[PDB]
Amino acid sequence: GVPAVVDCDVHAVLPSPHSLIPYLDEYWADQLVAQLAPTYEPNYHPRGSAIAQHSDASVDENGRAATTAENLVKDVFADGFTDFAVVNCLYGVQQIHQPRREMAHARALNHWIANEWLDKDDRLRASIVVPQGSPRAAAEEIDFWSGDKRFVQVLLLGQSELLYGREINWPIWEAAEAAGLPVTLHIGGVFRQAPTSVGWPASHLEWYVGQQSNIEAQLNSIISEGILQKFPKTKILLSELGFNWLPPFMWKFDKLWKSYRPDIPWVQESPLELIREHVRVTTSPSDGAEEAGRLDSIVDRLGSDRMLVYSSDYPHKHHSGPRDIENGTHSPELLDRIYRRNAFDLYNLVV
Amino acid sequence: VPAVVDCDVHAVLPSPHSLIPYLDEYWADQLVAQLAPTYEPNYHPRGSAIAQHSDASVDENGRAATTAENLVKDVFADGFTDFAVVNCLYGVQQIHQPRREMAHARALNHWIANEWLDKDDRLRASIVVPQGSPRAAAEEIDFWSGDKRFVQVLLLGQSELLYGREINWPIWEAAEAAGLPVTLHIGGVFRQAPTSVGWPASHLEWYVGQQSNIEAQLNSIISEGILQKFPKTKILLSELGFNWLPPFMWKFDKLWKSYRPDIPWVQESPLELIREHVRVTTSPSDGAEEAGRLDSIVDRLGSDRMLVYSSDYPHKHHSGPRDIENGTHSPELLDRIYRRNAFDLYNLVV
Amino acid sequence: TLPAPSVTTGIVDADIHPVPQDGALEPYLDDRWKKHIREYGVRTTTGLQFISEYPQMYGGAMRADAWPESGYPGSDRELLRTQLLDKHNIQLGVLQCLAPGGQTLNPAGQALNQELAAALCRATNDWQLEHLVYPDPRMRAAIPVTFETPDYAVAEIERVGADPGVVAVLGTSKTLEPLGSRKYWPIYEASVAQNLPIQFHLSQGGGHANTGTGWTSYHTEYHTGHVQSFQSQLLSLVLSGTFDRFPTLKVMFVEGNVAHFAPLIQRMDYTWETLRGELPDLQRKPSEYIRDHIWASTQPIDEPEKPEHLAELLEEFCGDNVVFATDYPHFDFDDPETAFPRSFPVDLRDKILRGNGMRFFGVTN
Amino acid sequence: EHGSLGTLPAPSVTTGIVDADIHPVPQDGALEPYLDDRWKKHIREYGVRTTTGLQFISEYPQMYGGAMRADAWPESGYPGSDRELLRTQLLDKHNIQLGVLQCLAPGGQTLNPAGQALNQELAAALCRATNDWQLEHLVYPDPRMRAAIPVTFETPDYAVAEIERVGADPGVVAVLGTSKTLEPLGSRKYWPIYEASVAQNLPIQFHLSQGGGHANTGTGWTSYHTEYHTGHVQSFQSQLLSLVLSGTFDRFPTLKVMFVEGNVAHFAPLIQRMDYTWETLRGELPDLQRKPSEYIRDHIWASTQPIDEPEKPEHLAELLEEFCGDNVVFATDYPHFDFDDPETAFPRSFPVDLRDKILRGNGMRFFGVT
Ligand SMILES: [Fe+3]
Ligand SMILES: [Mg+2]
Ligand SMILES: [Mg+2]
Ligand SMILES: [Mn+2]
Ligand SMILES: [Mn+2]
Ligand SMILES: [Mn+2]
Ligand SMILES: [Mn+2]
Ligand SMILES: [Mn+2]
């Protein structure tokens, strides 16, 4: 058995909320039709902007990419390189304030993924979407899918209502660990405060670049609050959030931990080490690490060659493509870790 | 016979050093080593006119209510009051570091118990809880539930998440399990702007406007389902006014009728739920003390069971604790307010 | 030159929600903004492409009988003429356009790209004047402007504010800073220079949670919760001394209810008696500002258990400063024939329906 | 400063170094000669209310000894409150010839930045009193020190008025803002302040702050002190993205801004990601005149303290150069506990020429020293 090439972040796009009806109870299905079916399509990848879909993508009757398994599989697997792909559906159930409806639609969304995606091609896996406004309901949604091994990780958004290390959110980490599932943070958010500590970014471009700041906050919260000692099998995947910001954050957080360790005495290993050992990052976007020598440089600055895992971020369009990362390194060994070995730690998927 | 209960008076912590006898060495030593930052809140700024009336006894620093002996001397002097519910508003809920929040909240309750409750058997108190960890707040409630001189749970009017959110159900569960009402007191964690339109620029603007947050809290508590999941729940609104309640209740009733299938577990009208589960202290009276206005506001509430007497000692308000008598012609209503309505909360006899 | 509004036998309706049909704003929008909308939508304070954070419940919160043969309620000007203006003899119907397309509440002024927001406010003002006001001058415009970029809003008030088809400036109930902040004083200055009063309509967004203590869950919380923003705004506009600086400025709170203002003001005065030292520059007692500066429209009418309580509370707020509104075509529409309780005094009901709004908008017979 | 007013000479950096962040504090009552009676009364009765529910402290009070170095305490006052101690322990000891005062605390009972007082009229009075005080007590007695003048960024009218009042004084070398604001710093709201600073030929320094009106991260309030202190760099990241992507430097092509005590190295992968994203999504901002990273050399500076400490020291110089090697300026942050010493701040293998211009030429260019 050889570790498989896993595309660690691809997207399924819900056509409309009507696609959820076959998976909702009659109360919720009737409600949704009576409400005129407002769509929680997010603005994280605005559907008309250059990032939403690359030009070479298969599209449905309305011009939209990645709304059917048939279109995604046709594109993602065309060139024979990829063995499996991890599907994340970003349909904005986490922005549903009504907590019952958040629960119902998250559940329906996972049903939709299972029946119309995972059932349709055995090369697909998926994250579990959870109603993260009720952490205890989020744990129950992890549990509900924990027997279906095609669901391989738990989806959380980069910007939450409360930091993910707060005890309030411990049921999510505990259920994820108990089910043997890594937790992924994906760009996006619940927008229950300003997306930055200094207010509301005025453009999508400003917002998209700046969400790395929130991932520093989440990682510092998760580690300082003790998640990695309390739930020591935790694995965290950062999906589509960059990674070049990680070293300067790791260094500062290590520096200050040497002074403040008695404030968090359960953290007896450096963050540096804890991050290298517990955190993985997808490679799309590469944020310039694809330029000559820059992937070797960032791996050196990370101090680990185990963190980068391959993704295409299909169908999204980035300045460099899924395998342009090869331009940034001279090491076949590193490329083998990024393309298959690193992800084996997350999913244990063999060819 | 039901006792005259002063349903909201205040203990003022002299300084964080007063907690040192009730902190484990780790927190006591640390306290000293951080130079003892005080979490004295700004809800009643110590140098402002609300902080203490001019007849209140003061300590060596000019501060009222920093000792049980001074509070007891003032509150019970005229013989009218039989018991007083003590609320200490020291700002433990604004400690961000969750373990320190838990430690200081526990130490504060120990301080109340040893230096206030143990010194006069006419005093009762609320339980201060680390609200930023609802699980720990539940454990704090459990811990003090065996001391029946703690008669209610203290929550601030402005919270981090609305108190009806499932995240906060452990607090309501623990309070119901201990047979304790839950009070919301003016004050806040200040983890967002105190209004939905940003930061009030003055204490006066903030203080008046916190009534809006109590509308949010009650609608969240009721719509989310607290009164059906925890049906023995009792809510006391302390020092948040009350004249705003009828226009809120009527709108809430009207929209509950529009939106019934959204919240199907709410099968009684919010009008009746609020009249049955919510009580309110009378200091400040916010103009209900003027001629006829107390009968009027009871008419508008549609219940004479909600208002409970308080002085809000040692605070200074535009009218005094007994000035509410000028707003009614009914001795029966005054008997509800002074004695009978609070019996529903504490079951205290003379 | 359009004639001044005239109210004689009919009534004032201070809140009407028209909607531009699909593409109706494109003739007034620069080309740079059209493309932007096609690609980005109208981004605001959400993570949602097309809806706001609290999308409406049953049937888009619109009257079931107010849907045209095609298009969204409020988008057919014939249906608005017969179903609203003719049917209730409205002679001054004030338009508050809350959405640039077939939505129920997505204000142009709240686009996070404020250049886009000013453009959309501009197009909305050109559109409502040509499409609705000038063809049927029973309607007049409350013009949306970008309150969070006062330079742009002053420019727009200078561009169209003097047009006799305009009777007010339109803002939102939620803002990043409370409305007595100095940030908005240039807008109050420009409005006073054009003899325009200002209407703040119920809104979502603004930059903060919809209460001062967390985001609401259920519909009963969201809809009742709208009152709270208006309470906060009244307190800021009064206590900041805004009306000391602008002693002729009139503001109306639209669809924040009315009765709750009366206990709020009573609590304001009572607290101010003790704590007025903090604000020594304030020139009058807080409640004394209401009469000359603070108006409220009626819809959705307060419904006390004992009907009598309505007139009492309206008078305790200020009976001269209460103005009728239908909120056509929303589902909680108020009918002037049936909104008032049976025992309601006729004088109060008559000036709510006529004189009160006439004086707010500067209208004569 | 676009017309100077005063006879005090402009700063001269010849053989000494520049220190871009020094924290003096007024002795108790030292501001009162400069405050109207109405504000002294206000402070006595209400303190200085800000974005907390706390009478005396900020929402994240300091941990060990108030976060001061244990050796910088005078006979009587707080660290930084003794002018002679600061002259011998800092200005003489490290031969600092341009030390820029960054006063963000009125002093005594109140340690929050003047600009953050929720009463903005009080905020403006505190800022003004600070500027009168620091010019009379520190700068003019020892003009090795120069003032970065705090102003009320959240009320631009008052800030413009203060910049016009003292911004031409040769004792003043910068305008002083905070790292946290209610709107990101590229917002039009702050443009009248940038205009006034430009008119005085003044650069702007934004120092690390709490407050601002939002939580200290874009995704909730922090719990532990590692989260709080590390989290400070996030505000700077957000402010850099806003100032650049807003086109603020198109409108103000001579405006110079420095991020003070926001670290340095993290800016380089941030700018890198900004350019990469902009390559795809630039069509959203068609008026932005330059590629985002080209604004850096002309517009964005950063101070050193606290020095980034990579595991492999060779990475420091690389990331500083990836940010911009001409725009990194030395600082001590006297007298805070993570104080950086110019003799030991840099790692043994650091390039000497880069080090020299961080200590001298880079700050001289930022502050207009010629
Ligand atoms: Fe309306
Ligand atoms: Mg290297
Ligand atoms: Mg005066
Ligand atoms: Mn992705
Ligand atoms: Mn009280
Ligand atoms: Mn409506
Ligand atoms: Mn500093
Ligand atoms: Mn420092």
Author numbering:
A (entry chain C): 28 to 378
B (entry chain A): 29 to 378
C (entry chain B): 11 to 375
D (entry chain D): 5 to 374
What wording appears in the published article?
Here we report that the 2-aminoisobutyric acid hydroxylase from Rhodococcus wratislaviensis, AibH1H2, requires manganese to functionalize a strong, aliphatic C–H bond (BDE = 100 kcal/mol). Structural and spectroscopic studies of this enzyme reveal a redox-active, heterobimetallic manganese–iron active site at the locus of O2 activation and substrate coordination. Metabolism of 2-aminoisobutyric acid (AIB) in Rhodococcus wratislaviensis proceeds via the initial, selective hydroxylation of the pro-(R) methyl group by the monooxygenase AibH1H2 to furnish α-methyl-d-serine (d-MeSer). Previously, recombinant expression of AibH1H2 in Escherichia coli enabled its structural characterization and revealed distinct mono- and dinuclear metal binding sites housed within the AibH1 and AibH2 protein subunits, respectively.
Collectively, these results indicated that the incorporation of two manganese ions and one iron ion afforded the most active form of AibH1H2. To determine the locations of these metal ions, crystallographic studies were performed on active preparations (entry 6) of AibH1H2. The unique locations of metal ions were determined by analysis of the anomalous X-ray dispersion collected at either the Mn K-edge or an anomalous isomorphous difference map stemming from diffraction data collected above and below the Fe K-edge. Two AibH1H2 heterodimers are found in the asymmetric unit. Both AibH1 subunits display strong anomalous scattering at the Mn K-edge above background levels and lack observable density at the Fe K-edge difference map at Site 0, supporting exclusive Mn binding at these sites. In contrast, the dinuclear sites in AibH2 appear in two distinct metalated forms. View 1 of AibH2 contains a dimanganese site with a fully occupied Site 1 metal and a partially occupied (∼60%) Site 2 metal. View 2 of AibH2 contains two fully occupied sites with predominant Fe occupancy in Site 1 and exclusive manganese occupancy in the solvent-exposed Site 2. Since this latter view represents the only location of observable Fe content throughout the structure, we hypothesize that the bimetallic arrangement of View 2 represents the correctly metalated form of AibH1H2 that participates in substrate hydroxylation. In this scenario, Site 1 is the expected and observed position for FeII binding, as the coordination environments of Sites 1 and 2 contain five and three amino-acid-derived ligands, respectively.
